Amino acid sequence: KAGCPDNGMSEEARQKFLEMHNSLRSSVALGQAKDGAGGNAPKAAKMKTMAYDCEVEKTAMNNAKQCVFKHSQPNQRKGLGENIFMSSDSGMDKAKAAEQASKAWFGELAEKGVGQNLKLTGGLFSRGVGHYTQMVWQETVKLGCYVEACSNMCYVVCQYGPAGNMMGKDIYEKGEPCSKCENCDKEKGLCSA
C-alpha cells in the first residue's frame, strides 16, 4: 500500500496484506469474529486502522531473504512485532501467500480461542495465539511484510509497528466500536487514520 522500492515484493501483495489486516481488525472490533473460547471476541472501543510502511517492510525483508523459518531477533527489528508463515509451495503467487498467511494468523482466534479478558498473561501467551493478537493489537498501526520464494518454502514475514504483544498489556480496549476514538470509520468500527 504504496511508495515502496521495487525490491521483489509485489504491490498486490502489500495491498492484500493491508486490506486483510484492516478488514479482519474491523470484524473483531464489530463483535463479528468467532472466538474459540466460546462466543465472539469483545467489541473494541478504539481499534486503530493500519497503514502500510515501507521501512517496516524492509526489516521484514531482512528476515525473509535469509530463507530460514525463524523469528528474527527483537534486535533485528527494534520496536517492531513479527508474524511468520510458510507455504510448501515456493512459487505460489505472493498476494495469494499474503492471503493464506493472514488467514492462518487470524485463524488462531477461532481455532485456539482467546476469551473475554484481553490481558496478555503468561496464561494467554501459552495458548499460542500470538499471531492473532499481533494482528489486532490496538496500538499497532504500521504494517510491513515481505514474501520470499525460498528453496524449500514460500516464506512470509510481517513486522508490526509499534510492536504489539507486550506481556501484561491488553490486546485492545473493550467497548462499543468507535466509542473511544476521535474520528471513527463508522462502517468499519476502526479509528480513522
Residue 131 annotated as lining a ligand binding site = yes
Exposed, middle or buried, 60 (CB in 10 Å: 0-12/13-18/19+)? buried
Residue ranges in 72-120 assigned as alpha helix (H): 94-106, 108-111
> Which cell numbers hold the place of 140?
499497532
Q: Cα–Cα distance between 135 and 140 in angstroms, integer? A: 8
> Which cell numbers hold the place of 91?
512459487
Contact 4, 54 (CB under 8 A): yes
At CA 80, angle to CA 105 and CA 135, rounded to 5?
A: 25
Residue 71 annotated as lining a ligand binding site = yes
Among 114, 115, 136, 108, smallest CA distance to 25 is for 136
- Summarize the annotated binding site for Zn(2+) as residue ranges: 71, 131
- Summarize the annotated binding site for Cu(2+) as residue ranges: 71, 131
- Summarize the annotated binding site as residue ranges: 71, 131
